[PDB]
Design a protein around this ligand. Structure first.
Ligand code: NDP
Ligand code: NDP
Ligand code: 5WB
Ligand code: 5WB
Lengths: 165, 165
């Protein structure tokens, strides 16, 4: 029924960890730079918790915050309360990026068409996870090694998967 | 329609600069060494401007110059005036290397199967750029750090991408 491409944007470790104590467990500026380039000009869909850890709208993109709170407001951001409201808000969009965290990934999981996933080759201590996915009907359409250096201290790969349908 | 592998050979910086004042903006002998090793025994396809900055044929390879000039001639070099003429000239070749500059990269962009790209981690002053590429259905199949030393004063990586089709 929806016509925008629903894409996931996530970074995770070898045990699917995405978060620790409501924060990112790793510092990877180069990964962030890849994320900004890929998502620029497209809506970001993020969970209330995810957003408040940032505290500020990300420029050049519609920032849409998903919460059950019907009186929740933040300047420079739009607020949705469900999958369907997000779909209404993004009716005419080309592609939207589901941007985390876990609760919001779970929420949008039945509708994902494309998966932009960074895989970090390290086992972090974590408390928040990227949900399991059945990859049957999914094709890897892009893979490349991320930049490892003194500013980016882990090995990691950018992966993109597309659903076949 | 064509049977030869069409490969790009290019070095660019972090903003896609490949040229300044009809020349290379950097001196990297080690990068040249990798280029000669990789392209040896295979045709080089070069734009007229690119070639004249060199002024002489590169040994051990067919040098093919692309120009609109129907009376253009250079000793020890072959001359093509279109994509199709290059294809005709290279119909039996296993792999040809599109060797620059930008106008010629643009020209052969719809037909590229393999991308040999050096990425230089520096922002040069430039006037000539490597075209944007949609890398969907491309996979990185090789990546290695280039030699940084007193003779090669920048950080750079060799990348190879292959089209999946
Ligand atoms: N590595 C990565 O790619 C990323 C990692 N992260 C990490 O993830 C963690 C945050 O994830 P998580 O704790 O899951 O929190 P979320 O970001 O998923 O936010 C959860 C909130 O979303 C709202 N929500 C959840 N379900 C619904 C629903 N069905 N309808 C309406 N609103 C809903 C609720 O808001 P409310 O309570 O206000 O009602 C809930 O509290 C952090 O550690 C963060 O650093 C986040 C993004 C990316
Ligand atoms: N960093 C790198 O990997 C490389 C960088 N370079 C740099 O790039 C710059 C040169 O690039 P650029 O200025 O784009 O010049 P090009 O090498 O792309 O040559 C342009 C010329 O090619 C011919 N040409 C262009 N389009 C066509 C066409 N459709 N049909 C037939 N002939 C055509 C024309 O020749 P004519 O006028 O005779 O008709 C045109 O003037 C230089 O600075 C060089 O150093 C070059 C190679 C590699
Ligand atoms: C850049 O802006 C940020 C974004 C996020 C977000 C995310 C993400 C995110 C990342 C990092 N990588 C990928 N591949 N996908 C994602 N969805 O939550 C962790 C947190 C940040 O710091 C608290 C950010 O810095 C202000
Ligand atoms: C070696 O022979 C040369 C070739 C080029 C060519 C190129 C290239 C080129 C380079 C350097 N690196 C990569 N990764 N791809 C390319 N396509 O145009 C700039 C210029 C030269 O000096 C004027 C060369 O020395 C005689």
């Amino acid at each position: 029924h929806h016509h925008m491409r629903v894409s996931f944007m996530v970074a995770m470790d070898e045990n699917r960890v995405i978060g620790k104590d409501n924060n990112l467990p790793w510092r990877l500026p180069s990964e962030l730079q890849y994320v900004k380039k890929t998502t620029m000009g497209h809506p970001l869909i993020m969970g209330r918790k995810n957003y408040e850890a940032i505290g500020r709208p990300l420029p050049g993109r519609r920032n849409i915050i998903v919460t059950r709170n019907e009186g929740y407001h933040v300047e420079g951001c739009e607020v949705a309360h469900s999958v369907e409201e997000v779909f209404e808000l993004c009716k005419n969009e080309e592609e939207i990026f589901i941007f985390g965290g876990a609760q919001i990934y779970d929420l949008f999981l039945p509708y994902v068409d494309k998966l932009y996933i960074t895989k970090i080759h390290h086992a972090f201590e974590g408390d928040t996870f990227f949900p399991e996915m059945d990859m049957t009907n999914w094709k890897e359409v892009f893979v490349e090694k991320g930049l490892t250096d003194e500013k980016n201290p882990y090995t990691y790969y950018y992966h993109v998967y597309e659903k076949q349908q």
